[PDB]
Design a protein around this ligand. Structure first.
Ligand SMILES: [Ca+2]
Lengths: 223, 57
């Protein structure tokens, strides 16, 4: 997260880290056994780390639980990035508490201008590389589909939205993928892609979760 | 054009996945951050794979 702020320990209790010997993506806890992330975060052998703040230290509220299933959307297109969503089943159910909690799925799509919270352990520099110890947060608005298409001609599908600031300086970045965009207590987005990080005229692009709610519920239930 | 001589490509996705690329200036396979999509060919999951494909380019 570039241009954000330190969340505070366990203030985003649905945020998880996906670990393959190191942190490589985020995700969002949606019930005690299931996490939502990005399809491009697929790896075999994922360990989900819940209750994290400092990801480089064991602080006392962590739960480390291996993935038992990592299910990419059956129509994910690795060229166009359409349908960039994945569901991870936990091998055992997480213990839910004040520091480990699920986030609700949306009941309807969010509109342009709606303010959201984006979080992750990704790079904090727009030029260069600095990875944080603790979780970072950013407040950013959903942008219009028209503005998103203007920023990225030919690239934005009905399952994507832009969020952020056209002047630059505030965005998601490498290591934030798969993590949450939460608006009014609902998971509306998944960190997906962009053009650089926090560059002028190049807002971040996010998977539009409201389009997948029926698929998420049915897939969870049939696995 | 030898794909082993191309600079490493992070791409547009926002993962932080460690991959290998052949660094012809240094003469060795090195790590870099791959964003998770649209990989170019100078991008390997292990140093062994990179050395096998590109070593001595
Ligand atoms: Ca920790």
């Amino acid at each position: 997260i570039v241009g954000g702020y330190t969340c505070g320990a366990n203030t985003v209790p649905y945020q998880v880290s996906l670990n393959s010997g190191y942190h490589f993506c985020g995700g969002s806890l949606i019930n005690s056994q299931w996490v939502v992330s990005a399809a491009h975060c697929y790896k075999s052998g994922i360990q989900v780390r819940l209750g994290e703040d400092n990801i480089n230290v064991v602080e006392g509220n962590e739960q480390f639980i291996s993935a038992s299933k990592s299910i990419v959307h059956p129509s994910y297109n690795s060229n166009t990035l359409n349908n960039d969503i994945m569901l991870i089943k936990l091998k055992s159910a997480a213990s839910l508490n004040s520091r480990v909690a699920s986030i609700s799925l949306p009941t309807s799509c969010a509109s342009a201008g709606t303010q959201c919270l984006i979080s992750g352990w990704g790079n904090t520099k727009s030029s260069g590389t600095s990875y944080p110890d603790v979780l970072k947060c950013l407040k950013a608005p959903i942008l219009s589909d028209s503005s998103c298409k203007s920023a990225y001609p030919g690239q934005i599908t009905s399952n994507m939205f832009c969020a952020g600031y056209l002047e630059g300086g505030k965005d998601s970045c490498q290591g934030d993928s798969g993590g949450p965009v939460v608006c009014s207590g609902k998971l509306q987005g998944i960190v997906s892609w962009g053009s650089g990080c926090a560059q002028k005229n190049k807002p971040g692009v996010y998977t539009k979760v409201c389009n997948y709610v029926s698929w998420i519920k049915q897939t969870i239930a049939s696995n | 054009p030898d794909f082993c001589l191309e600079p490493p490509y992070t791409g547009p996705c926002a993962a932080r996945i460690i991959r290998y690329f052949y660094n012809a200036k240094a003469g060795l396979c090195q790590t870099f951050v791959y964003g998770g999509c649209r990989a170019k060919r100078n991008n390997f999951k292990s140093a062994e794979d990179c050395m096998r494909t590109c070593g001595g380019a």
